[PDB]
RNA sequence: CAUUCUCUCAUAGGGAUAACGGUGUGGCCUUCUACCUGUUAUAAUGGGUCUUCAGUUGUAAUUCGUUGCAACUGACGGGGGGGUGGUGUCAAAGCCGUUUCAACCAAGUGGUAACUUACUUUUACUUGGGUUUAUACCGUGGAAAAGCCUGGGCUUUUUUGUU
RNA sequence: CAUUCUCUCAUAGGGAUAACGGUGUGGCCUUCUACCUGUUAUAAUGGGUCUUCAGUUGUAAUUCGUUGCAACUGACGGGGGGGUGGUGUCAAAGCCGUUUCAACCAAGUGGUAACUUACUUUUACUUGGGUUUAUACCGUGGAAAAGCCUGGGCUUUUUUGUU
């Protein structure tokens, strides 16, 4: 029947994708092993290839085995579904402690049961698509969440005094009674077929307690339980956005947020589970940066990888610290770490004004921020000479940053860190007996570093220019006004 | 370059689409002419191949000329857009009298400017798609408008009292100052590129007064002008749905709908123009048989061909009358009209229980009703033998009807009309001198019209069974519950054999 | 005003009128809403006395 | 003025060619597809029957939300006018049955018929997707007659190709 | 147990084969991309420069909605500690300059340091988009050698097909 062929197709595609990912993993490991041997010399460790541990718990977790017997698995699953005796096997569940102090139970289903939950719940979320609230996402890394960060950003700016009330539904989704879920299958004009209903009931029967967390099932079953609360909150006028389990609620009027708080409390009582505000306090006013206190009178809302304010959008502090970590660690790897090893055997020592290690460091920093773009390409796109510009970098995950001062400070930080790292590298090289304090890398003095690096050219193409966040931010602002958030985020779309 | 290539592609696609339609038009006119010659006999009128009138007002309206110079037209248009000296040519405007007081100015642009508008304003409405209200459509026949009718139906079925108010934005879109549009460009986080602003300003300069009523440009500008009204109405808690130059607003509380009236008044004042509610609507309360809250209380609302009540969704009376007219005219044309002519020259007369005209009439009715689906296919889809049943018919335009009584009445009407038409055809045949009363079509007796027709088979296929609305409605209910309104109303998707 | 929900709607009415005229109206210095309560109880606001 | 090709002074113009683009039927291929029965070595062909929903009961499970199977039961083709029998009774209702009239609008209008390349805000769609014989269409180009003019042009028909 | 093929009772099992799937580099096609200048008769190839935003002025259109062109002005690479000078003031804060220290966290900690197959909800991505010489990886297979066992089987390395 068509069902078996559809299963076969989905299972095969999933297995092939995982196999391709593993092959890329091992090839990348080998290439990095070659580079590390050429970098640390004869002190580099050996090449270690690791298979994911859960590939061993059950033979179905292995993509290779699934590709071996995809036909048989599809036939058996189709027969069991049409006999209504299907149950998804136990998912491999790992408990990752949440930073706030909680724990998130991440469940990974087997490839067969992960393919069936991506075929029957990606259709159920299309036919019943218009019956869900506008801002309701599944994982905090989804590409459509950035449409919500825009809305808040557009409101925080316009209504200069916005009341916010962030919430946490983790305990709610974790332990919602299955009967309440099963009572919503025929309301709000949901189109759920008899087969899809059976599959939903099988997946919920496996859990016995509540909705799964990190699965395609999560989004639909979350939009199937909080469909009355959503409608109530819309009817009060307060806007909202649920990322995975958090639920921010914002509106201009105090009364509306006060009523939304009561609506959420009543919904929590109705479901029989407790919903608690994530913020220690309840309502919180996010006013302009300059103003006294009243309820909270805060000026920075976090959301994800952002810090929204009435003035502008900016990168969250933790994300900025991680960017600093990665850049400083790239410099430390390519400049300082090899020299700290007990023996300099098989390491290229800079000489003749050429420092291949410095070139590698700058190139890797560029790939991490720009993605490989040279400044000439970015300027060409900005002027109009170029029709296309590909965005793939750490700045491609923040295509809404309006804060120019933060990028300026971060660029200055990059320059200063490069200068200090080069100074320490020169000191260590001298301590090892190889005195190089008059060459190109070490002649620059923190005010000519950018200029001298820019002038320097390799193979006819500038390969030393110090990367700058501000230029790519200008490019992103231009791109968003020509392609939109969607295209900038997902360049593959054509 | 790129702009030139894109313009070339879009213009050529538009021209080829229009040419394909014209080729099919005269190929369709010829087939119907042949059938007419075999229906009206030797008195049949001669064939006529018309050519759309607006293809002569300007050469650039002609699909057969715009394909000749698509390269040159794209070259010049690109050069003029890069030189900021591009003004779209005058569109052809026709005034269609609205059924109520008023006129609709339908504008048909030239193929080049239509291509440019369909290219630039489809991207502008995609990048800024999340900044527009949920229910906002361009045409009353739009296939995505059923997503709003389902919402109103669900609200009516669930709520206890639903207050509704309908508005008219026809004057709003005909007298809105363009300075307002220009002022509404950089707010609400709209991503309008510099050249996409130039083209908007050029298209608005061409009009000088207001938004073109019908075109790809219409919807984006309608959503761009009425972006504060949508935000305010959303903030109050009253839902809305615009579709074409109209606005329904429904809410559970009278105070909220009154505040919606006040918000529309303020917005109309700000724009400098008037938004008048339809003069026979006020606020309609579709209560659940409860207290009327001292407001005009009705039980049926009319919305884009549907009659929405608190218990069922049915076909509007006007649409039912149109369906009845079409079926009755099919029967009259295929059974009665050929006989009323002054001479029966070269017309096939019933013989040996065979009535080719009756078979043609029943098959045409089946195509209009179902789309050619035989009852066996529909029952196979219902049982489960098959998984595909294309919905191509009049009932494909009403995939939300829950009313079973209306469909039963319509089926009985079809049966009665078929019986009466066959009786009149027999009378006329006798008057002409041919007594076919004994023949098969003229002995059915009405009660056995549906019974004896189903048993009869032609070419080993049941081609006489009288089509029924109820069976296809059952099939549509199952198809909806298994595929969604989008797929039922949009029967191409990717393709068949999609596994 | 006697209700916080009402004075909060006064900042929103001056914020919209300020944008309608196209000029800014800022709260004097950094005073903010001041609750001159009779010591009955506080309501999530800076309770002053003078 | 090829709707073909080509060139350029490129939303316009010039040059070259007679073909360019589509339609119905049939065939082929790929689609999933209950049950019976004719003609044959198991294939084609012909014919025939079924497919739905609601409720109850029984029955095996269930995470008590619900599901599976069986047995049935019920539903599953409008309205109007003129007659007309029965049934109803403060008396009338009311109900049911029977007969007759119609193309629909018309369960209507002061009054009624016509119409589909039509009519109407939008009243919008057509056989499940690709190939391959015969039929044939729009506008073109030729060829032969036919009537207007001139003494080549214009005009009609047919034919040819497109095929 | 090839991640290859194939069969079946089919989410498990059976049989057969040595090959299956990927990576970096270059090449071949695509892809629009300014200006000058080396290098051989307009081609290749070496080198160099420029591209941004805001505001003002002039000027052109002008739908008064704006736009175009030209000129000019301004912005266009962090923070901290120690030392030091100038400027401020009733003294000071304050401002400007200069020198030195620190790989980042660190604008910190009691205290520093280390780490990228790492860390962490969600830390995510790697050069628009297609082919194919030489290099080479995942798990397989086969040989040789080398250790164990037996008296071939097992283990290790190299090599080979893969390629
Ligand atoms: Mg909704
Ligand atoms: Mg919105
Ligand atoms: Mg009548
Ligand atoms: Mg430090």
Author numbering:
A (entry chain B): 1 to 494
B (entry chain A): 1 to 499
C (entry chain C): 251 to 300
Paper text:
Here, we characterize a two-component DRT9 system, composed of a reverse transcriptase (RT) and a non-coding RNA (ncRNA), which exhibits a protein-primed DNA synthesis activity upon phage infection. DRT9 system from Escherichia coli includes a 499 amino acids DRT9-RT protein and a 188 nucleotides ncRNA. DRT9-RT protein comprises five domains, including an N-terminal extension (NTE, residues 1–64) domain, a fingers domain (residues 65–159 and 176–211), a palm domain (residues 160–175 and 212–315), a thumb domain (residues 316–371 and 394–436) and a C-terminal extension (CTE, residues 372–393 and 437–499) domain. Structural analyses revealed that substrate-free DRT9 assembles as a dimer-of-dimers (tetrameric assembly), which undergoes an oligomeric reorganization into a trimer-of-dimers (hexameric assembly) upon substrate binding.
